[PDB]
Ligand binder design. Structure first.
Ligand SMILES: CSc1nc(C)nc(N)n1
Ligand SMILES: [Mg+2]
Length: 208
């Protein structure tokens, strides 16, 4: 039922660097995730422009932010295009090998971790705040899958039989014990307003 894969070496190295480097401006992970969701919502809107049935699995294009203090999770949900099993395994549909290469040269040459999103690997900035990340995804062309990784060089993929989602991606951040400020409503609102003010889809911050 559960398959375990090794990260490619460059992605393991990116993740160690993210986890191990001293770097205080951790809040940017949320901008990077919301941006990835905005990109996914753009793709499904674009397909729907020529085939409206692409939206049978859900017409509303939005992002929800759901903090849960009991489980210590921040979940970002979008109703974007979702990912196939193949996309999930291939670095969550990114060109993570070459983006990691360019990001790491950029760093050597004075860049900082906040510019990670310019290299196509902003997903992995989740590991600034999360000890484990769970991604549940559903693409129109495939079943619902759950990817998961606490870093250390491996990730799992299984068919997900949790709550169906229709279409899109849900990123569940199991936060590090010292990063629970990102479950506080005013902290989340501050970061969305600071870094995500011009995203073109409604962003709903759920209350507890
Ligand atoms: C990199 S794939 C991805 N990542 C996130 C955070 N959201 C979506 N929709 N896709
Ligand atoms: Mg590549």
């Amino acid at each position: 039922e559960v398959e375990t894969f090794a990260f490619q070496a460059e992605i393991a190295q990116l993740m160690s660097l993210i986890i191990n480097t001293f770097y205080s401006n951790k809040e940017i992970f949320l901008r990077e995730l919301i941006s990835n969701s905005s990109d996914a919502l753009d793709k499904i809107r674009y397909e729907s422009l020529t085939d409206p049935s692409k939206l049978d699995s859900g017409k509303e294009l939005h992002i929800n932010l759901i903090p849960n203090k009991q489980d210590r999770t921040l979940t970002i949900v979008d109703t974007g295009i979702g990912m196939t099993k193949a996309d999930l395994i291939n670095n969550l549909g990114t060109i993570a090998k070459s983006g990691t290469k360019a990001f790491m040269e950029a760093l050597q040459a004075g860049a900082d971790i906040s510019m990670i999103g310019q290299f196509g690997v902003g997903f992995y900035s989740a590991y600034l705040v999360a000890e484990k990340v769970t991604v549940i995804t559903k693409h129109n062309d495939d079943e619902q899958y759950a990817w998961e990784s606490s870093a250390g060089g491996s990730f799992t993929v299984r068919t997900d039989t949790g709550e169906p989602m229709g279409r899109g991606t849900k990123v569940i951040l199991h936060l590090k014990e010292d990063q629970t400020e990102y479950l506080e409503e005013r902290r989340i609102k501050e970061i969305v307003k600071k870094h995500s003010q011009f995203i073109g889809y409604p962003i709903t911050l759920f209350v507890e």
